[PDB]
Amino acid sequence: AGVKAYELRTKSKEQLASQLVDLKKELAELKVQKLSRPSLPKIKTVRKSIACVLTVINEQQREAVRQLYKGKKYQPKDLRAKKTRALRRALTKFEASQVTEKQRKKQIAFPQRKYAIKA
Amino acid sequence: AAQKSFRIKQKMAKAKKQNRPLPQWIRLRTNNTIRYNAKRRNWRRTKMNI
Amino acid sequence: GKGTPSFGKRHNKSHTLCNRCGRRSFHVQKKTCSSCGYPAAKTRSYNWGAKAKRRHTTGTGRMRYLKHVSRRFKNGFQTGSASKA
Amino acid sequence: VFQVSMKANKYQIKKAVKELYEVDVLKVNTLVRPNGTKKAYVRLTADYDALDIANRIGYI
Amino acid sequence: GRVIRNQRKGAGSIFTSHTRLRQGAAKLRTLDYAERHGYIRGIVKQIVHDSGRGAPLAKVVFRDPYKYRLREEIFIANEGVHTGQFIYAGKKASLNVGNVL
RNA sequence: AAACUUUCAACAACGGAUCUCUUGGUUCUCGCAUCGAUGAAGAACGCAGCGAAAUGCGAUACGUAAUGUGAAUUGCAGAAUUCCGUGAAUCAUCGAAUCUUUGAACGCACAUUGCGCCCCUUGGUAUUCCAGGGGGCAUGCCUGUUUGAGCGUCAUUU
RNA sequence: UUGACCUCAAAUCAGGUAGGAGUACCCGCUGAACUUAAGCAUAUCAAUAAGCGGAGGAAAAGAAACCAACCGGGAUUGC
RNA sequence: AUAUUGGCGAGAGACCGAUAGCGAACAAGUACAGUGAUGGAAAGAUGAAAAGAACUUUGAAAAGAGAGUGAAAAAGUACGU
RNA sequence: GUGGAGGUCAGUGACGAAGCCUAGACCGUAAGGUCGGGUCGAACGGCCUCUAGUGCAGAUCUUGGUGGUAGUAGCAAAUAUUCAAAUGAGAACUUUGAAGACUGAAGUGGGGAAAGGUUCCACGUCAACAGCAGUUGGACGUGGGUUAGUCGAUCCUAAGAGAUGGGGAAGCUCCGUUUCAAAGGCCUGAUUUUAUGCAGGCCACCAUCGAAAGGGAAUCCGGUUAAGAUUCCGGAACCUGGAUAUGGAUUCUUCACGGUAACGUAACUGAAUGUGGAGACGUCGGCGCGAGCCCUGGGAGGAGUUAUCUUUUCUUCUUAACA
RNA sequence: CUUGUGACGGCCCGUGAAAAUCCACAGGAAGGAAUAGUUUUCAUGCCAGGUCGUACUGAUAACCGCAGCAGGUCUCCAAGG
Ligand SMILES: [Mg+2]
Ligand SMILES: [Mg+2]
Ligand SMILES: [Mg+2]
Ligand SMILES: [Mg+2]
Ligand SMILES: [Mg+2]
Ligand SMILES: [Mg+2]
Ligand SMILES: [Mg+2]
Ligand SMILES: [Mg+2]
Ligand SMILES: [Mg+2]
Ligand SMILES: [Mg+2]
Ligand SMILES: [Mg+2]
Ligand SMILES: [Mg+2]
Ligand SMILES: [Mg+2]
Ligand SMILES: [Mg+2]
Ligand SMILES: [Mg+2]
Ligand SMILES: [Mg+2]
Ligand SMILES: [Mg+2]
Ligand SMILES: [Mg+2]
Ligand SMILES: [Mg+2]
Ligand SMILES: [Mg+2]
Ligand SMILES: [Mg+2]
Ligand SMILES: [Mg+2]
Ligand SMILES: [Mg+2]
Ligand SMILES: [Mg+2]
Ligand SMILES: [Mg+2]
Ligand SMILES: [Mg+2]
Ligand SMILES: [Mg+2]
Ligand SMILES: [Mg+2]
Ligand SMILES: [Mg+2]
Ligand SMILES: [Mg+2]
Ligand SMILES: [Mg+2]
Ligand SMILES: [Mg+2]
Ligand SMILES: [Mg+2]
Ligand SMILES: [Mg+2]
Ligand SMILES: [Mg+2]
Ligand SMILES: [Mg+2]
Ligand SMILES: [Mg+2]
Ligand SMILES: [Mg+2]
Ligand SMILES: [Mg+2]
Ligand SMILES: [Mg+2]
Ligand SMILES: [Mg+2]
Ligand SMILES: [Mg+2]
Ligand SMILES: [Mg+2]
Ligand SMILES: [Zn+2]
């Protein structure tokens, strides 16, 4: 059982918030009934449903922030790339490709020609 | 030490939970090689040294 | 009576738990751990202690974050998500 | 009597009980059980009955 | 051979002086404008025994000429100085017992 | 003559040798370059219906989201619509997240679950007191902004 | 009086950046002794072990203030 | 072009075969000792499948004697030989 | 003769390979080889060559296991146990009753600090431990239990430790704790576009850590649990911090009066700054005073002895913090 | 008898901690009344007081002496003859 992720994504934040506070309610009363019956595996689906809603709530919030910071430098660090420490510090392909005027003229004038040795 | 720090009392709780025999349903799983709780401790023979 | 009678007077922990390694080797008076070198920034380690390095080297723990870096590298550190092929 | 998260203090416990159960709290006593959990002793005002609240929660 | 005793004192592990009960460093009043141009007056308040010192201390109270405070000095008591005695320190002080000419 | 000792054989003991297996190790060869202040390695404590350990994970806690596969898991119970399907699985993959207290560890400390300060907000008849929620306050150094200090020093005055 | 310059500070000032781990290989510093010499001090073990600082998938070196003495060769690296 | 007892991914051996081979084929850097730096094990094999002995009887009970499963209880969780 | 490798005997083998036992047999001088018989259940051999971690009685050899000694040495300090009943299959050791004893208040009592860590208490339970025993347990299995504005920590500083500014050291790090520092907040008022910069003024230690016996704000009594209490319940208090309203006080001589005086009261403005006090203190001897305990009279209740005597012997009659 | 306390006396070439914290005084900046003020060291009146330890032994058995070892381990209360 439990709530599925895809149909939650069609909701809004207030509906999700109402869903969450409702979800936390039964987990309370399932927990008090857990000590009554010898076993109750139904609580597992309840807790997972809370996680699914919480992920959905977070997912919507970040995307709206991403749209807010779209198209301008200095985005929040957690929304940046998490490749490595080294790669983030590495030279970008633009700056690595930069070359002085003296060398650019030599490359354009004298590139490595394609030659064949048969005759 | 009746008057003890919370850190020591936190190590207290885990030791209480550790000291418990093997659950019986562990015996019945397929390819079960565990015979008993080998890491059992008792206050008379082994001290925690914490 | 340096033997049994003297052994009875041992009730003062010279060391306690280390905040960094949790070994019960933190010297209370010296305020320095004798195992991991806390509070010094560098972790205590010696090349003559070949066994000692092996006990606390990387791999003996969880690699809470470094487990997946090889998996991430194999995919070339892709970004985004799948597309329901 | 309630089991409470070890990060909660008496202010939060008093705040929460009157929230979920809409019942005023006289005083709160807390202790750490030997198993590592926190146990809260919440005393309700004489205007309210603990037994009536207890089975309303679902245990008695 | 083993390090002999007189060497071992220099490290100052247990050979430092026991200074718990001393009332303070017995120094004269600092040399300022008043003393090198005139004289200043003081009052002997306490004649205290100093721990580890045979001579007694004289505890003289002075007035700060620049701020309204009551700078208190610790002298080494000379034979014949009594409590409540006025003490004169400075270049123009009269030659009397306890003065700091 | 019996008992007893000793020798031998059968059976039975003690003990675990030999024989036969081997998800292990060792050695050699080939390919790749990927840790961390966007918080590493390591530590502590916790999380399952029934778990002590190993493994997994972090109050979203043997896990959530996404994709692929296509009907399970299993010791028991339970759950079934999940079965011609946006769909079982302790499945595989893995790009989105969560990630307790720590730790280079960064408000100050730490043998304490100690003590602070700033902003927004809520309640307590409150800018000052108290409490709750959220976000912050390390060191060195670089570039740039702002405010400055120095008869170090110029010009400009009256 | 006003405005510059130079030097030096302060900002929870706008951006960054360094610290730790691993260390088989790599770049340096520091640095022994056992042992051999049928003893032993120079020597040898050894410009090694331990210790300390610093990177990458390689590092380092690298295009002669070179080798040569020949009819001269021609960065570095390795067999 | 060179190095690499580390890390990741692979292929092999006139290598070793549970007192061997890594200390560790197993909940091994674990249990355990030391105040501490550190030191540091032992421990693999029922059976094809638990089919792990229903039931009767003696005993307070553990168990024994029967009965039974099994190709084999001269395989009975102290289990290959 | 052994482990492994190349080649061959289209070698042996679940109709039983290897291994193990066999005063059963055969061959070789021997190292050894072959067969029969019992157990056994999955691989192994003959020959030509190759290769080695290849042959054990010793090494006070290593690891593991087992003997004689041997049912032996022995289980003898701490004065001491006995009868009956109950549970129980089983009682010298368990429970209860009775009896005899001991510790004898610098205890075998009642609590604590360091340490231990659930040993505390309950239920069931005796396979191993309690060097006999065991129905018992500090054992085994399953659970319960630790409540604080006033008790401690947290706060302060002591001997001491230890950053920063600095200066050494190749470096890990060392020295130093106010030192060759541009080392900050304190309060009042203005502004009510408005939040707080300008108005001012003020001050000079200049991190931090360091005591569960040093210093320190404030709680007592009664009752309750299987196990908690100065923490829980009832009652009665106190301290700190903060918002305040009333009453009281004082004022037209604006910030009170009285007493000669020591001084008294219900209050009875007071910033910067300075001074003082408390915190804050050795040891011994005797003396005075207080509290508790001990002794004892009268009386008010209860119990014991009573062949005889004993207005007798023992016991209850208590009053916290705070005002 | 134990203990607290007061006033004393003896002893020293020994004269027998510091800090946090609280109060008072000196001071007179400032603010203050009459148709109304001033006053929160007087009384009453309201609210809050977080966090962590709290069980038990403390020893011829709960600590260290490999152990249920005649050993060692700081302290409080102490009836009658
Ligand atoms: Mg001692
Ligand atoms: Mg010490
Ligand atoms: Mg508490
Ligand atoms: Mg020699
Ligand atoms: Mg020689
Ligand atoms: Mg020699
Ligand atoms: Mg080295
Ligand atoms: Mg290079
Ligand atoms: Mg170069
Ligand atoms: Mg020991
Ligand atoms: Mg057989
Ligand atoms: Mg068999
Ligand atoms: Mg024989
Ligand atoms: Mg056979
Ligand atoms: Mg088989
Ligand atoms: Mg050999
Ligand atoms: Mg032999
Ligand atoms: Mg021999
Ligand atoms: Mg031998
Ligand atoms: Mg005998
Ligand atoms: Mg004897
Ligand atoms: Mg006494
Ligand atoms: Mg008990
Ligand atoms: Mg026995
Ligand atoms: Mg027995
Ligand atoms: Mg230092
Ligand atoms: Mg402190
Ligand atoms: Mg204290
Ligand atoms: Mg004192
Ligand atoms: Mg009191
Ligand atoms: Mg008690
Ligand atoms: Mg009460
Ligand atoms: Mg009056
Ligand atoms: Mg004083
Ligand atoms: Mg009274
Ligand atoms: Mg006394
Ligand atoms: Mg005296
Ligand atoms: Mg208690
Ligand atoms: Mg208690
Ligand atoms: Mg007790
Ligand atoms: Mg005691
Ligand atoms: Mg005692
Ligand atoms: Mg012990
Ligand atoms: Zn450590």
Concatenating the DSSP letter of every residue in E1-14 gives -PPPHHHHTTT-SS
Please state whether strand G lies within 7 Å of residue C48 at its CB atom: yes
Resolution expressed in Å: 3.1
Please state whether strand I lies within 7 Å of residue B42 at its CB atom: yes
Helix (H) or strand (E) holding E33: helix E33-37
- The encoded tokens of residue E49 equal 């025994």
Rounded to whole angstroms, the Cα distance separating A29 from D59 reads: 10
Contact list in A for residue C69 (CB cut-off 8 A) is 84
Closest nucleotide over all strands to D9 (CA to C1'): J50
Strands (DSSP E) along E16-80, which ranges?
39-49, 56-61, 72-76
CA of residue B2 to ligand 38 center, whole Å: 9
Q: How many CB atoms lie within 10 A of CB A4?
A: 10
CA distance A100 to chain C (A): 31
**From residue A42, how far is each of A29, A39, A53 by CA, in Å?**
12, 9, 18
CA of residue C80 to ligand 2 center, whole Å: 58
Please state whether strand I lies within 7 Å of residue B50 at its CB atom: yes
Residue C1 annotated as lining a ligand binding site:
no
Q: Which chains neighbour E (Cβ–Cβ under 8 Å, 3 or more pairs)?
A: none
Residues 51-70 of C with CB under 8 A from A: 69
Locus of tokens 């985004």: C80
Residues 6+ apart with CB under 8 A from E94: E39, E88
Collapsed DSSP state (helix, strand, coil) of residue C33: strand
> If we measure between CA atoms, which residue out of E41, E38, E79 comes closest to residue E60?
E41
Q: Which chains neighbour A (Cβ–Cβ under 8 Å, 3 or more pairs)?
A: C, D
Q: Do residues A76 and A69 lie in contact, with contact meaning Cβ atoms separated by under 8 Å?
A: yes
Residue E3 burial (10 A CB sphere; 0-12, 13-18, 19+): exposed
Sheet containing strand C32-33, edge to edge, reads C15-16, C26-27, C32-33
Q: What is the DSSP letter of C43?
A: P
- The encoded tokens of residue A102 equal 């003296």
Contact list in C for residue B7 (CB cut-off 8 A) is 17
Residues 6+ apart with CB under 8 A from D32: B6, B9, D6, D38, D39
Which chain A residue has its CA at the smallest distance from D56's CA? A29
Peptide bond into A76 cis (omega under 30): no
Please state whether strand F lies within 7 Å of residue A36 at its CB atom: no
Closest nucleotide over all strands to A77 (CA to C1'): F38
Rounded to whole angstroms, the Cα distance separating D18 from D10 reads: 12
Rounded to whole angstroms, the Cα distance separating E74 from E61 reads: 8
Contact list in A for residue D59 (CB cut-off 8 A) is 32, 35-36
For strand H, the positions having any atom within 7 A of a protein Cβ are 7-9, 23, 26-27, 29-40, 42
Rounded to whole angstroms, the Cα distance separating E23 from E59 reads: 10
Q: How many CB atoms lie within 10 A of CB D17?
A: 19
Residue C36 annotated as lining a ligand binding site:
yes
Residue C6 annotated as lining a ligand binding site:
no
Residue C33 annotated as lining a ligand binding site:
yes
Ordered alpha helix ranges (H), chain B: 6-18
Torsions phi, psi for C76 (to 5 deg): 70, 25
Please state whether strand J lies within 7 Å of residue B25 at its CB atom: no
